[PDB]
Amino acid sequence: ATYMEESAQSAVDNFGLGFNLGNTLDANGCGTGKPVATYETFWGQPETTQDMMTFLMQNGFNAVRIPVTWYEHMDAEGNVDEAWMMRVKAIVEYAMNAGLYAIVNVHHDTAAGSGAWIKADTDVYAATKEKFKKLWTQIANALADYDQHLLFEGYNEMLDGNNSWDEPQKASGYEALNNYAQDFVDAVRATGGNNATRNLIVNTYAAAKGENVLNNFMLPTDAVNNHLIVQVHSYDPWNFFNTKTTWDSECHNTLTEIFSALSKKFTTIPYIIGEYGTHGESDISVSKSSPAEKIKLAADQAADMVKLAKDHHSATFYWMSIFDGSDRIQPQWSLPTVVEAMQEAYN
Ligand SMILES: *CC(=O)N[C@@H]1O[C@H](CO)[C@@H](O[C@@H]2O[C@H](CO[C@H]3OC[C@@H](O)[C@H](O)[C@H]3O)[C@@H](O[C@@H]3O[C@H](CO[C@H]4OC[C@@H](O)[C@H](O)[C@H]4O)[C@@H](O[C@@H]4O[C@H](CO[C@H]5OC[C@@H](O)[C@H](O)[C@H]5O)[C@@H](O)[C@H](O)[C@H]4O)[C@H](O)[C@H]3O)[C@H](O)[C@H]2O)[C@H](O)[C@H]1O
Ligand SMILES: CC(=O)N[C@@H]1O[C@H](CO)[C@@H](O[C@@H]2O[C@H](CO[C@H]3OC[C@@H](O)[C@H](O)[C@H]3O)[C@@H](O[C@@H]3O[C@H](CO[C@H]4OC[C@@H](O)[C@H](O)[C@H]4O)[C@@H](O[C@@H]4O[C@H](CO[C@H]5OC[C@@H](O)[C@H](O)[C@H]5O)[C@@H](O)[C@H](O)[C@H]4O)[C@H](O)[C@H]3O)[C@H](O)[C@H]2O)[C@H](O)[C@H]1O
Ligand SMILES: [Ca+2]
Structure with a gap:
């Protein structure tokens, strides 16, 4: 056997630059029983190929998040197709x-x-x-x-x-989430093998990070040590892509405060920014047809996010924009200057 157990913090430190294969296996809404490819392409992304993953690794990324939506692939008894x-x-x-x-x-x-x-x-x-x-x-x-x-x-x-996108309206909501988290760790660990010590990720309420969400988050109990990671998302400052011209002091201060709050809350366990990007109100976001100034805005956000996470022994995963749609098939970056800013910031 070639498995080599690794601590949660070590894993997060080795993630480097991360990317989300978004709107792909997470795409849903076409109904049950369809061909697998119908799902994968339902939201406008191409079928994933080995070349895509190779492209990520060979261009300075060392981690990929693969969102999966499961309900259209489960029968009445919960068995996955x-x-x-x-x-x-x-x-x-x-x-x-x-x-x-x-x-x-x-x-x-x-x-x-x-x-x-x-x-x-x-x-x-x-x-x-x-x-x-x-x-x-x-x-x-x-x-x-x-x-x-x-x-x-x-x-x-x-x-x-x-x-509710900020906090549950009733405190009992936190207890439900915490129970789900525990059941997840429990079910995974119970299968044994590599899963006994695999690094597992648990997310905050709404993947948010307001003061109450952080205070009411409680890490599941785990019999093995240093194999849990906490995840939040960060499209911060909220709606900055539609309201800011440049990535200025207000933007930078927003991010630096976020990482300070996260590092203060989570002291012995690593945390990650599992998604970040320009996506704001009405999910408006950057693309290669955005004005040069707006693309630079995205580049500056990414560079700061990447650097701050490095400083805080965290890690980040870009949500979609840098490697999207038909560009995946080439394969080439959708937003080469954003990626270049990330590479420079990390290295
Ligand atoms: C808290 C946090 O960090 N959350 C994270 O936020 C990320 C950024 O928003 C998010 O990614 C986005 O996810 C949405 C999906 O969101 C829905 O599901 C989750 C709910 O909580 C949320 O409220 C819902 O809105 C992605 O939206 C999907 O985009 C698909 C592709 O759109 C793109 O290409 C087409 C173009 O028109 C769009 O402008 C462009 O964005 C779109 O695909 C189209 O679907 C229809 C079928 O639609 C039906 O079935 C799917 C249902 O969602 C839909 O309501 C229903 O009508 C097809 O006929 C078309 O051919 C397709 O193009 C999806 O409909 C749309 O939902 C968004 O792009 C993505 O950035 C993270 O997931 C999240 O963790
Ligand atoms: C002294 C004084 O005047 N103080 C001022 O008080 C103001 C009122 O509270 C306050 O404005 C509020 O600021 C908060 C956030 O403020 C800081 O921290 C986060 C930074 O991003 C931000 O730049 C900082 O200024 C705003 O919170 C955002 O609210 C979004 C929705 O709010 C809007 O719609 C609902 C309505 O009731 C509100 O009035 C309206 O403003 C919320 O939107 C959801 O985001 C998720 C994705 O979330 C991910 O990415 C964003 C991350 O922040 C988040 O942690 C992560 O999970 C989407 O999927 C949902 O679709 C969205 O709905 C944002 O998450 C949340 O940050 C608040 O709106 C605003 O009123 C002043 O800042 C303060 O100085
Ligand atoms: Ca720490």
């Missing part, structure tokens, strides 16, 4: 083959979209906890043989039944 599990496995292998770290999660099974069923709510938790544990048991077993470069992330963006 074999064709779907094999495709998730195949894309994981692309990443493993390229020498990348990879994260597999449970994505639009949470939050505000139709089909979401995992929610920070007492009644929802009660009704879904068995399905959630069975889902993760299947994922853990399916991906059991991959080594320490593969991490599991329990859930993406858990909200209450009100879809």
Whole structure:
């Protein structure tokens, strides 16, 4: 056996520059029973290829987050379609083959979209906890043989039944989320093998980081040590892409405060910025057709995010924009100057 156990902090330190393969295996809404490719391409992304993962590794990235949405691939008894599990496995292998770290999660099974069923709510938790544990048991077993470069992330963006994006409206919501987190760690660990010591990722409420969300977050208990990572997301300052001209002191101060708050909260365990980007109101975001000034804005955000995370022994994963759509097939960067700013900041 070639597995080599690695601490959570070591993993996060080795992630380097990360990228989210977004709107891909997380895409959903076309209905059940469709060909696997129908899902993968439903939101405008090409079918993933080995070349894409190789391209990431060979151009200064060492980690990829692979969001997966599962509900359209589960039958009435919660069993995952074999064709779907094999495709998730195949894309994981692309990443493993390229020498990348990879994260597999449970994505639009949470939050505000139709089909979401995992929610920070007492009644929802009660009704879904068995399905959630069975889902993760299947994922853990399916991906059991991959080594320490593969991490599991329990859930993406858990909200209450009100879809409240800052905090649950009722405190009991936190207890539901914390229970899901524990069940996730428990189900994964119970499958044994590499999963006994695999590094696992748990997300805050809404992947947010306001003072109450951080205070009410509690890390699941884990029998092995230093194998848990906490994740938040950061599209900060909120809506800056539509309101700011330049990445100025206000922007920089916003990020530096965020990392200070995160490092103060999480002292013995590493945390990551699992998603970041320009995405703001109405999910408006940068593209190669954006004005040069707006592209520079994106570059400056990314450079700061990357540097600050390095300073704070964290790590970051870009949400989509830098490597998107038809550019994935070439393969080439969508936003070469943004990537260049990230590379310079990290190195
Ligand atoms: C807290 C945090 O950090 N969250 C993270 O935020 C990221 C940035 O927002 C987010 O990524 C975005 O995810 C959304 C999906 O969001 C939905 O599901 C989760 C809910 O909580 C949320 O409220 C919902 O909005 C991505 O949106 C999808 O974009 C698809 C592609 O759009 C792109 O290309 C087409 C162009 O028109 C768009 O302008 C361009 O953005 C789009 O695909 C189209 O789908 C329809 C079918 O739509 C039906 O089924 C899907 C349902 O979502 C939809 O409501 C329903 O009508 C097809 O017919 C078209 O051919 C497709 O093009 C999706 O509909 C749309 O939802 C967004 O792009 C992405 O940045 C992280 O996931 C999150 O963790
Ligand atoms: C003394 C004084 O006057 N103080 C001022 O008080 C103001 C009122 O509280 C305050 O303005 C609020 O600021 C907060 C955040 O402020 C700081 O911290 C985060 C930085 O990003 C920001 O630049 C800083 O200034 C704002 O919070 C944002 O709210 C968003 C939604 O709010 C809007 O819509 C709802 C409505 O009730 C509000 O009035 C309206 O403003 C929220 O949106 C959701 O974001 C997620 C994605 O979230 C990810 O990326 C953003 C990260 O911040 C987050 O941690 C991460 O998970 C999307 O998927 C959802 O679709 C969005 O709805 C933002 O997350 C949240 O940050 C608040 O809006 C604003 O009123 C002054 O700052 C303060 O000086
Ligand atoms: Ca620390």
